């Protein structure tokens, strides 16, 4: 049963659209869906190839992710990412040197944040319990 696999690893949960939907609903109610959106945004950004034809799209995307989740140090993603990590990202943005893996560290920190609090809480939530 898919729902059982989701309790074995966060990666299993996020590899299932029903799992993602349920988990995002839970996060939304807890006021932190940005954690998951950001996680997927980094993955989506990274899979874009660094060729000339994608240059403009990639820069606009990198800026968008930065502006919404990294810029203001008050959002939940920004609050859960390290100063040095955000500094490096800002530098990539300003220099316009945006390697596909530039958000990797931030993504790892946010992934840990979910594994540490919201993921476990989700598995013990009414939403999950009801679904199962």
């Amino acid at each position: 049963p898919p729902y059982l696999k989701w309790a074995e690893s966060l990666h299993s949960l996020l590899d299932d659209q029903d799992g993602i939907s349920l988990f995002r609903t839970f996060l939304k109610q807890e006021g932190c869906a940005d954690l998951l959106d950001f996680w997927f945004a980094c993955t989506g950004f990274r899979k874009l190839e660094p060729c000339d034809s994608n240059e403009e799209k990639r820069l606009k995307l990198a800026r968008a992710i930065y502006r919404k989740y990294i810029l203001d140090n008050n959002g939940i993603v920004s609050r859960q990412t390290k100063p040095a990590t955000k500094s490096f990202i800002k530098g990539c943005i300003m220099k316009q040197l945006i390697d596909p893996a530039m958000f990797d560290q931030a993504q790892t920190e946010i992934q840990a944040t979910m594994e540490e609090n919201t993921y476990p809480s989700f598995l013990k939530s009414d939403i999950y319990l009801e679904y199962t």
């Binding site: 997927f40 989506g44 899979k47 606009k60 800026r63 968008a64 919404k68």
Partner: peptide, 16 residues
């Protein structure tokens, strides 16, 4: 820079 651009990016990373 754009929620719509972020949404397209997020969608591309979804399973299936």
């Amino acid at each position: 820079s754009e929620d719509d651009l972020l949404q397209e990016c997020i969608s591309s990373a979804m399973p299936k």
